[PDB]
Paper text:
In order to understand the molecular mechanisms of BusR signaling we crystallized selenomethionine substituted full-length BusR and solved its structure to 2.8 Å resolution by single-wavelength anomalous diffraction experiment. As the protein was recombinantly expressed and purified from E. coli, that lack DAC domain proteins and the entire c-di-AMP pathway, our structure represents the apo state. The four central αCC-helices of the four monomers constitute a four-stranded coiled-coil motif, thereby forming a robust tetramerization interface. The RCK_C domains form a dimer on each side of the BusR dumbbell.
BusR is a member of a yet structurally uncharacterized subfamily of the GntR family of transcription factors that downregulates transcription of the genes for the BusA (OpuA) glycine-betaine transporter upon c-di-AMP binding. Our structural data, supported by biochemical and biophysical data, reveal that BusR utilizes a unique domain assembly with a tetrameric coiled-coil in between the binding platforms, serving as a molecular ruler to specifically recognize a 22 bp separated bipartite binding motif.
Residue numbers in the entry:
A (entry chain A): 0 to 210
B (entry chain B): 4 to 210
C (entry chain C): 1 to 210
D (entry chain D): 11 to 210
Write the structure that this text describes.
Amino acid sequence: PMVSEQSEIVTSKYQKIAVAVAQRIANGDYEVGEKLKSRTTIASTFNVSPETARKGLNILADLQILTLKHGSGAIILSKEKAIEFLNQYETSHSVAILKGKIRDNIKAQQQEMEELATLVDDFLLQTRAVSKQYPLAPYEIIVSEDSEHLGKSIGELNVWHQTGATIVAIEHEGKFIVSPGPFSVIEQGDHIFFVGDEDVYARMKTYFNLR
Amino acid sequence: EQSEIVTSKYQKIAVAVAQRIANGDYEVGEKLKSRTTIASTFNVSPETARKGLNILADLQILTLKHGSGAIILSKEKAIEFLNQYETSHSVAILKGKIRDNIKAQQQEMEELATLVDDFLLQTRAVSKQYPLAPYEIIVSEDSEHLGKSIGELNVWHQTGATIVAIEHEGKFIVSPGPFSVIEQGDHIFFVGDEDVYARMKTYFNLR
Amino acid sequence: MVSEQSEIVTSKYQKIAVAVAQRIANGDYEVGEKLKSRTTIASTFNVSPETARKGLNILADLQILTLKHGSGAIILSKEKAIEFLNQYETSHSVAILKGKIRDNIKAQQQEMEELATLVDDFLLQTRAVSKQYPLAPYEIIVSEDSEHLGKSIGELNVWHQTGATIVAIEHEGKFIVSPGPFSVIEQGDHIFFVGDEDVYARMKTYFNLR
Amino acid sequence: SKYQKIAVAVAQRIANGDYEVGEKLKSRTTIASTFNVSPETARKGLNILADLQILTLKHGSGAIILSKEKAIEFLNQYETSHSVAILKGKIRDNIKAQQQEMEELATLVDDFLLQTRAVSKQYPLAPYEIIVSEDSEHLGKSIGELNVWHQTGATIVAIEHEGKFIVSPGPFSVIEQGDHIFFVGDEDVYARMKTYFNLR
């Protein structure tokens, strides 16, 4: 019921022979019109039995790469079918090559993430540089659906107290107005322009687009 | 330009005193010092320091309408003000969270690499311990061998696999023989070497 | 860790266990039927009687067999042989790694979702260097001594009288951005504000300059 | 960078309409004094807008503004070409490239994990073992020509011949005396298998 200890687990030798000779055909060592040698001579090539070599060649005969209907030897039929058979048997899709593809993927992504780390470091460097280069350049927030104090005058909202930002412009329903004043009312779906320091966008975010 | 960019001096004072209130140095209802005393504590003008506190007055954290000094109203609102004003979503902290994210992800992908190493070693070592253990594949519709019997399909030639069972339309058949047809949606059980699943895959539902 | 001069193998007794459980579960060994002697099973599997003793003890502990009889082992449950097979497969080494790899992949997808949202929020915080030209600031100087000095901006209702929103004040060499209504105007400051061209003139006429 | 800032500032004025289309600026030194910058730098600052055809300086008297539309174009490209914009785009490209790579990984590990074999679950697919202990009848022939499945209803899955355990041996495989033959089927296929080989 068990594999005998002296018995080594193997696959069918006839398939092995078929693959070897098909590989030679696909390489061109055995040309298309070229015929193979006797059934005993091919056995001598791999030091194997002639009958097993015949079965190996019967595999390729059934796969129509060669024909054995002629006693002189084996005449080759299609090199193109040999390459198709080689691609199919050597699947180039096993768990081994897929491991290599997966390892290549992980290494590429690790390199990309380090690249990302340097990119975001420099992005912070550039936000700190622009805050000094163009200190009056405006920000724009989009007052999204999750909303709390919409429909309220600016003066009543005490915006500057909690955000440190001065509201400078309002796009309300596609209408761009600069310097709107305290009685101006904001609804949802408006673009709000403001000026301040590096963190006023964050403060405006937490204050307006977060309940 | 020819100067140095600075934010509102009053906001800094407001934030400082609000933090002290939130830490508990100035408890609720307790009396504060004069606008001039804390001004000297902060090395600022009494008038500017008063406006710094006027910010918190308008934010209803304290009241100063009694002249004796400033009375604390709610520490709870001071905490809210600190959470809202101080950094909670800036690009500086977000950079740090992003870097923590990428480093954690690097560790996972490294774990993934060792996991796939061990998975290949285990599938190969297990294949010797169970050389007749079956595989199971599902034939999709993208297959040219549909409606054909195993005898002409020459499966063993091209896959090195021995079909042992076929699950066709909810009926499990063991040892089906050449007079069995493969249709879309069948489970095909087979034995072979470690690469036969791949060979079956490309042979049936690929190319 | 496994040395490069070693191998991993499943113990023979476990192989015996699964083999006999498979026979029971497929029905070759009916429930009532007795198994052969511990020595006969050892010879059939070419293993020591002691390893066969471990295999039969495996199925005994799983209540698939009982050995209180010297004649042999009596079959107990066909379904529990199937249960044992279920547990053995799902407990196999490649099964555990299969689950671990799937969990790792799932965790990494969530981490990248978190990353996507974090970089969304990170990237959104950018100020417009030039695209906004109606928001380019204007500049007046408190050059001519005017009125309402030493007062903050909110108490003056500047926007009513000039229609301008102050964005920055340079008071004696300190550039202050977003100074708020509590900020003071003195003589000799650079005053930056936003509005249109008729608001520039209005600011000027308001502060007694032009 | 100060010269770039002046260029942007004056382009902003032109684009907002502060300098009407065709209005003249004063001599470069007069506006340069308005800024806290040297006139020498300001001359290059306006040379920038001259090179982009926002203004012309061939009138020593001063600067003549040309087109508001081209000033806006300059502003748009200036924001896009600023180093904070390009890094933002690069970071977005990096994140999306990694998303696709993980998409690929998701498909690769799916195909990679699918390739497992049922060590114990397929109890109906557990093989039987027959021993050709009696050399008689069907022997020395390939199993495919032997009509094995035809007459026994069994599919041979392994053959142990002379100390070599062969998995999936194929139709071209021959049976000799003393081989262990593994096959799959039912309880009655085991009996039929055995009976077939003049064993019992």
